[PDB]
Amino acid sequence: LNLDPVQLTFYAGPNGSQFGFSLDFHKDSHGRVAIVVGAPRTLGPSQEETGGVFLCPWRAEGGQCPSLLFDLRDETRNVGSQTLQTFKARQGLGASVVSWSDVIVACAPWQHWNVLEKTEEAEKTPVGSCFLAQPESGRRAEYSPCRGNTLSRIYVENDFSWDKRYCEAGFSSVVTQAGELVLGAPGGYYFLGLLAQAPVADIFSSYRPGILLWHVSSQSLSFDSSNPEYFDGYWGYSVAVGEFDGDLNTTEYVVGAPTWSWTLGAVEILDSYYQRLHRLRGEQMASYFGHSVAVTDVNGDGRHDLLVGAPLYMESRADRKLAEVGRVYLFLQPRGPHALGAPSLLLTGTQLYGRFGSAIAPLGDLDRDGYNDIAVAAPYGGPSGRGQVLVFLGQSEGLRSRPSQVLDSPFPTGSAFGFSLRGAVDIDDNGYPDLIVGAYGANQVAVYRAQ
Amino acid sequence: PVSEARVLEDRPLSDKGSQVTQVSPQRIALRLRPDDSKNFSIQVRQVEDYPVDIYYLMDLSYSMKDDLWSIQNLGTKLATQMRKLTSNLRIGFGAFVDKPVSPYMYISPPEALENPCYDMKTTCLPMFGYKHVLTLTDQVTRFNEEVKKQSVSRNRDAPEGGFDAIMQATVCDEKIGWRNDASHLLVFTTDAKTHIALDGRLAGIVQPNDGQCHVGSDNHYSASTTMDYPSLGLMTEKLSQKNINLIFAVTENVVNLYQNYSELIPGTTVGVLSMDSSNVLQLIVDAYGKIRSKVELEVRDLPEELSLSFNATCLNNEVIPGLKSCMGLKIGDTVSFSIEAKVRGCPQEKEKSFTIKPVGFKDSLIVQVTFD
C-alpha cells in the first residue's frame, strides 16, 4: 500500500553469477542491518563456477558489495583403507542463504562426494553441504549430514534403504528462534526427501578442519517411508516453522512436497519429532502445490495461519480452458484442537504463464493497522511478462481479496523479478518494514522502502 | 444476340480415387453481350483419400528394455491398417531417455559415462535427452528396419524426460517433416512417470522452456541440460498451434495417471500398450480415421472487366446465397456452386479466360469468355 515505487535501491553483482538467487537480512552485534545475497554461479579461483555470498551494507544509492570468503578447494583425505573426496565444481554455493543472530548459513546443494576403497566406491553423488560463517569473529565451519562410507553393493542388496547419497542438503533452510538449523533434502531416501535438524552451536563446536567425515552428537533426521504416495514427492522443497499446537514449548515444522501422491502435492505440519499433525492436499495435478509455504497471523487473533503457493495452477476461463496463472491458498488456524479444513481464501493470477504464487513473503504490519500483510510474486506477470509483486493487506477475517499495490519490474525481460523476496525487517529506521526483491537474470537486487 | 454458356468438357465425377476427376464440368465456353450476365453450375466432390502423418516417440531407458518388442510390433500393425484407410501416409520416429546430467545420470567411474551399465555385468548405450532418428517418409520397410536397431540406455530415477521430446517433435517442423495439409498424429510411448516443469531445479536448471526448436545438424536436442521441462499449458498451446493430435501409449501400471493427465490437456487420448497388438490403440486410431474436410473455391486469372457471384449448395438442398464454400463434407460427398459472371461494357480484347478451382486440388474449371 505504501511501498515507494519511484526511489529504488539497486545492488549489482558480477555478470552471469545469478546474483539475487537467494537473499536475507543480517544484523551485527551493533544492530546495523545489511543484506546477504547468494550468487550460485560465481567464478572460482580456476575460472570454474562455484557460487558465492555477498554482504551488502545499507546505502541509499546502492552499488557493489564485498564478498564473504569461503574455501573453494577440493579435498582428498586418507582414512585407513578408504579415500574421501569432495568435489566443489558447480556446487551452487549461495543457492540458499539464511541468517540467525550473527551467523550466516550459505548452502550448496550440488556438491559431490565420493569414497574409494580399493576397486569399489560409494558412487559420486550430490550429497550437498553447507557453510556456517561468523564474519565479525571470522569463524568458519561446515555441515553435511548426508555423507557416508557405505559402498554401492550394500545399497543394492538392501534395496536402497536409508539411502542419503542424493540428498542435496541445503535446497531449503530455516532456523528456529532457539538456534536450531533445519535443512530440507528433496532427494533424500532415493528422492523421497528428508529433513536434517542440528543446533548451530553444536555444529560450530563439533567441527575439525581436515576430517571430511564426522557426526554431530545432537542431530536428528526424518525417517524413510514405505508408502508409495511419498515416492518422488520431493519432501523438503520448502520448509518453514511455526506454532500450531497451542503449546509454546514445542515448535512445529511445515514442509512442502510439490509432487506428493503422483504429482498432486501436499503440505504437512509435523512436530519436532517428525510426527504428522496435519496434511493439506493439492487441488489439481502438476500445479506444484507446496512450491512455497509461509506462516504468519493475518487474522490478527494470535494464531498463526498458513499460505501455500501453486505457481502452475490452470484456471477455467471462457476463451482458454487451460489458463496457467497460479494460485495462493490461505488457511486460518481455528480455536482449540480443530483441524485445518477448507482453504479460507483463494487468490488467482491474471497473466498467462505468470507463475503467480511462486514466492510468498510475510511483510508484517506494513501500514501499521493491526493485521499482518503478505506479498506474492509473479516472476513473469504483467502485460509485458517482465514480473510483478502484489501486496495483499490483512483484515479481521483474513486477507483482502484485491491487491493494495502492484510493483512492476524495473529490469529487462527475462530477469525473473520476484524469484526471491524478503520483508518484515526495517532497514532505514523509519518504523515501517521494507521489502527486497531479487532478480537473478539481471544479477541485481531492488530495495523498496515503505512510508 | 443472347448470352450463352456452352459446356465443352463434361466428364462425370469419379467414384473411387484409383484419371480421377473431381470437378465437373471441366471446360466451359462462355459468350456474353455488353452489360449482360450469365449463370452456370459447377459440382465438386471429394473422391481422394486424406493425408496422414504419424510420428512415434519411444522410451529407450532400462525399464523399457524388454518392452521394445511391444512398441516395435505397434508400428508394424499401425502402419498396415492406415495403408488400407489412406494412400498418403507418412511415418517417422524418435527416441528419448532423460536429461544427461547428475543426479539423473551416473557419472562415476570414468567408465560409467561410456556406458551407465557398468556396475552390472552387461553393457548398454550412453545417455541422451532426445534424438530424431527417422523423418516422416512413405517407405514402411525402412521404418521397420530402422526401428529394429534401437537399444536402451540407463538412468537413475523412475520419472523420465519425455515431455521435452513432445515439444521438440511438435515445434521442429522442417526436421520432423510435418506436412501443411494433413492430419498430424503424435504417438507417445512410455511405462513410468514423467518429469514436469520446475522438476529440473534438482539438477541446477531454472531456465523455463521457451518452446523453440533446438534440434541441430546432429539430430540431438541441444538445450536438454540448459532449460527446464515444459509445462502442461505450453504443451497444450503448441499442440493447438501446430495442429497435432496426441495419443498416450502406456502400460497398464500407469494408465490411470495419464488418464488423469488427459483431462488437463484437451484433445489428447489414452490407450494401453499391451503385448499382442495393443488393440485399444489401433481401435482408437481407426476411430480417429474419420477425417472430413471442407471445400472452398478460388478464382484465378479473373479479368478486371468481369465480376463473379457465388451461390453455395452444401449437403441437402439448403441453398446459401453469397457463399462459395461448404464445410462438414464427408469423404465422398458432393456439393454444387452456381456462379454468375457479369461483364461491364464491352472489352476491346475479344477473347479472355479464367479458372475456378477448389482449394488444395489439382482439378479446376476453365471458362473461356468471348464478347459478342
Epitope: 534395496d159 536402497f160 532415493y190 528422492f191 523421497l192 514405505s226 508408502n227 508409495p228 515416492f231 518422488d232 | 531407458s61 532400462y62 525399464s63 523399457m64 528394455k65 524388454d66 518392452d67 521394445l68 518388442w69 511391444s70 540407463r154 538412468n155 537413475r156 530415477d157 523412475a158 511405462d191 513410468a192 501400471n253 499391451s274 503385448m275 499382442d276
Partner: antibody
Framework: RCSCRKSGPEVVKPGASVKISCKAS????????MNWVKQSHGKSLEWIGR????????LYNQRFKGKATLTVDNSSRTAHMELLSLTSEDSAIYYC??????????????????WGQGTSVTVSS | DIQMTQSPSSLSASLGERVSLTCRAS??????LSWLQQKPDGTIKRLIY???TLDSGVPKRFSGSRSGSDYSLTISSLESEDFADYYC?????????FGGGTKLEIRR
C-alpha cells in the same frame, strides 16, 4: 532378510469356508504385490490372483474368480485369502509370493520372487 | 492365455554331468520368463529371471540363454545339492502360467 510366514494346516468340512494368512516382514509390504499360488497333489502350480496392498484392488484368474477373495491388512503386514464353499477339489497346498508393484528407480518387476512356506488345506466329512 | 511346455518331464543324471531343460511358449513372450527350483521340503526359490539373469547367491553354474520361442536352463558340473524340481513362469500376460515341471534324478 525377507520372510513370508504362513499359517498352519487346516482341516475343513466339504461346504465350509477357510481363511489362511501370510505374514510378511523384511520389506516395505506396500510397494509389492501379493500373489497366491495353488499347487495340487500332482504338482501343476496355478496362479490364483494378486492383491494390491496400497489400495485393495484384486486381479483374479478367471478359474478362481468366484472361489477365493483376496484381502489385506496393512496394520499387521498380513495378507489373507478366503476360500468359499469348499469341496474335495480344493485340498492342496497354497503359496504366497511377493512381486514388485512400485519402483523408485529405472527398473521393472521381473516376476514372483521370495515365495512362502506352503499351507496345506484338506477338505473332508 | 499362454501355455508353456517343458520338454523333459523327468531327467536322470550323475554327479558332474551337464544337463539342460527347455521351456517353450505358445504365444510370444519377449524375455518375461523365470526359472524356479523346489527342493524336497516344499520351499520354492527363483534361480534365473529375465530368461538369462542369475539371482544373488546362485552359483555361476546355472545358466539360461534364449528368447523368442524356446528357452533353456543349463547346469554344468552338476552337484549333489541341486537335485530338485524345476518350473518356468512366464508373467508376460495375465493370467500367469507355469511350466509342466521337470524333476531331476540321480543316476547310480
Amino acid at each position: 532378510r525377507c520372510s513370508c510366514r504362513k499359517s498352519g494346516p487346516e482341516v475343513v468340512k466339504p461346504g465350509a469356508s477357510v481363511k489362511i494368512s501370510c505374514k510378511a516382514s523384511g520389506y516395505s509390504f506396500t510397494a509389492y504385490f501379493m500373489n497366491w499360488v495353488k499347487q495340487s497333489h500332482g504338482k501343476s502350480l496355478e496362479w490364483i490372483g494378486r492383491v494390491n496392498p496400497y489400495n485393495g484392488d484384486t486381479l483374479y484368474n478367471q478359474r478362481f474368480k468366484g472361489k477365493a477373495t483376496l484381502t489385506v491388512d496393512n496394520s499387521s503386514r498380513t495378507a489373507h485369502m478366503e476360500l468359499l464353499s469348499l469341496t474335495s477339489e480344493d485340498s492342496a497346498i497354497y503359496y504366497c509370493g511377493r512381486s514388485g508393484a512400485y519402483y523408485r528407480y529405472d527398473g521393472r518387476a521381473y516376476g514372483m520372487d521370495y515365495w512362502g512356506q506352503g499351507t496345506s488345506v484338506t477338505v473332508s466329512s | 492365455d499362454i501355455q508353456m511346455t517343458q520338454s523333459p518331464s523327468s531327467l536322470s543324471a550323475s554327479l558332474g554331468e551337464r544337463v539342460s531343460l527347455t521351456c517353450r511358449a505358445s504365444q510370444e513372450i519377449s524375455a518375461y520368463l523365470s526359472w524356479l527350483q523346489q527342493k524336497p521340503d516344499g520351499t520354492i526359490k527363483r534361480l534365473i529371471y529375465a530368461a538369462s539373469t542369475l539371482d544373488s547367491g546362485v552359483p555361476k553354474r546355472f545358466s539360461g540363454s534364449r528368447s523368442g520361442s524356446d528357452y533353456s536352463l543349463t547346469i554344468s558340473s552338476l552337484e549333489s545339492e541341486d537335485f530338485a524340481d524345476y518350473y518356468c513362469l512366464q508373467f508376460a500376460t495375465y493370467p500367469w502360467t507355469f511350466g509342466g515341471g521337470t524333476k531331476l534324478e540321480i543316476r547310480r
